[PDB]
């Protein structure tokens, strides 16, 4: 029960016969998972957490880097990956579902492995992740610093399917989402108008919504999604909303989070991304590593 750092290992449901790339990297370097769920619930116990300084994020990063590197020296469908604590250490799991990833958490649990997380490299929006339970969440190291990213957890899933390109979003689901987000931002930012506008500039992956499907890279136009005013009340001003994807040479998935950036009478937020570690921070906000005392 002492906070520390140590090398972790991965658990896979990998099958040796499958030639899918996530399998072949996992078969070699991920040990078989444990059927026993394991659990150790605690309560009225407080531990400080900081999702923005967690070495667990860096460890998944270097694995996926090596995964992609050795994979692309065709199949490509990720596997949910479990990251597990070694002997002498454990993983603390904060349980306040209203937790924002920083400060004290009064409800913890003890696990030796993580929940299944498949690695999905993307920008602007987080896909196939873990939905936030109950309320929608807002996470940043410093909201005062415009440069620091803002991760928004989705408590209601929106299905997204793009085929060989265009993308499909139900307007009813999306307009629900933005109204809440701006309302949460209205709590975090006073009196200020709160607009959503597309990426001002940068690389193609950041300016579009980029993702990989079955091995082919898709970059989708986001000017249609980020186009609203959402002040007192709500209002979206764009043309089911459809986005334009560029193939470079279908996927049934659901969005689970947002990535935003603020410019510094109105406060405007734009889609972002790039550091795939923040994609990993979306699924690792709960876990911390401690040394058994």
């Amino acid at each position: 029960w002492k906070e520390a750092k140590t090398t972790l290992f991965c658990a896979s449901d990998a099958k040796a016969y499958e030639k899918e790339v996530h399998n072949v990297w996992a078969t070699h370097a991920c040990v078989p998972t444990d059927p026993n769920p394991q659990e150790m619930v605690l309560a009225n116990v407080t531990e400080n957490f900081n999702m923005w300084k967690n070495d667990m994020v860096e460890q998944m990063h270097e694995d996926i880097i090596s995964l992609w590197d050795e994979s692309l020296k065709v199949s490509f469908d990720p596997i949910p990956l479990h990251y597990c604590a070694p002997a002498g250490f454990a993983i603390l799991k904060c349980n306040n579902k209203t937790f924002n990833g920083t400060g004290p958490c009064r409800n913890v649990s003890t696990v030796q492995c993580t929940h299944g997380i498949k690695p999905v490299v993307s920008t602007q929006l987080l896909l196939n992740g873990s939905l936030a339970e109950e309320e929608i969440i807002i996470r940043s190291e410093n909201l005062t610093n415009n440069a620091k990213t803002i991760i928004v957890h989705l408590n209601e899933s929106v299905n997204i399917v793009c085929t060989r390109a265009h993308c499909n979003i139900n307007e009813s689901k999306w307009n629900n989402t933005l109204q809440k987000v701006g309302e949460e931002l209205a709590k975090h930012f006073p009196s200020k108008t709160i607009k959503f506008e597309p990426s001002s500039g940068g690389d193609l992956e950041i300016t579009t919504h980029s993702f990989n499907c079955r091995g082919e890279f898709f970059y989708c136009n986001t000017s249609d999604l980020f186009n609203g005013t959402y002040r007192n009340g709500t209002y979206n001003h764009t043309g089911t909303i459809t986005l334009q994807c560029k193939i470079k040479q279908t996927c049934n998935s659901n969005i689970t989070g947002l990535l935003l950036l603020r410019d510094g009478d109105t406060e405007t937020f734009r889609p972002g991304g790039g550091d795939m570690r923040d994609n990993w921070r979306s699924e690792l906000y709960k876990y911390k590593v401690v040394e058994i005392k």
Partner: nanobody
Amino acid sequence: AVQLQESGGGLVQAGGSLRLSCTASGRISSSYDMGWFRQAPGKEREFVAAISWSGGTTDYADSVKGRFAISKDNAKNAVYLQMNSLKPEDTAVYYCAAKWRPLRYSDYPSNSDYYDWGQGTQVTVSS
């Protein structure tokens, strides 16, 4: 991830030249960009140069185009910045950086927010 260490900084007379080097620990995979940044006294950090790890395509800040050259040696996991015709406005701490871009569409390197960072090497250009 990649651990970076810069070298080569120091004092140089106006008009002189200096070559900076940066080597990582840890293998650099095919989708990385490597770049150089600098921070002058009391000023914000700015882009200097970048190079694509696999393709070798370069980009230079307008302030340094012609005067600096970025190069690489993949076998050594090293990147270099040859600085010629140095001027007092180049006095700064120079940082080497890496940016993993697995979803890049082209080989052209970025000039935006790099995510992995070295400790810096100081370059002082005397008037």
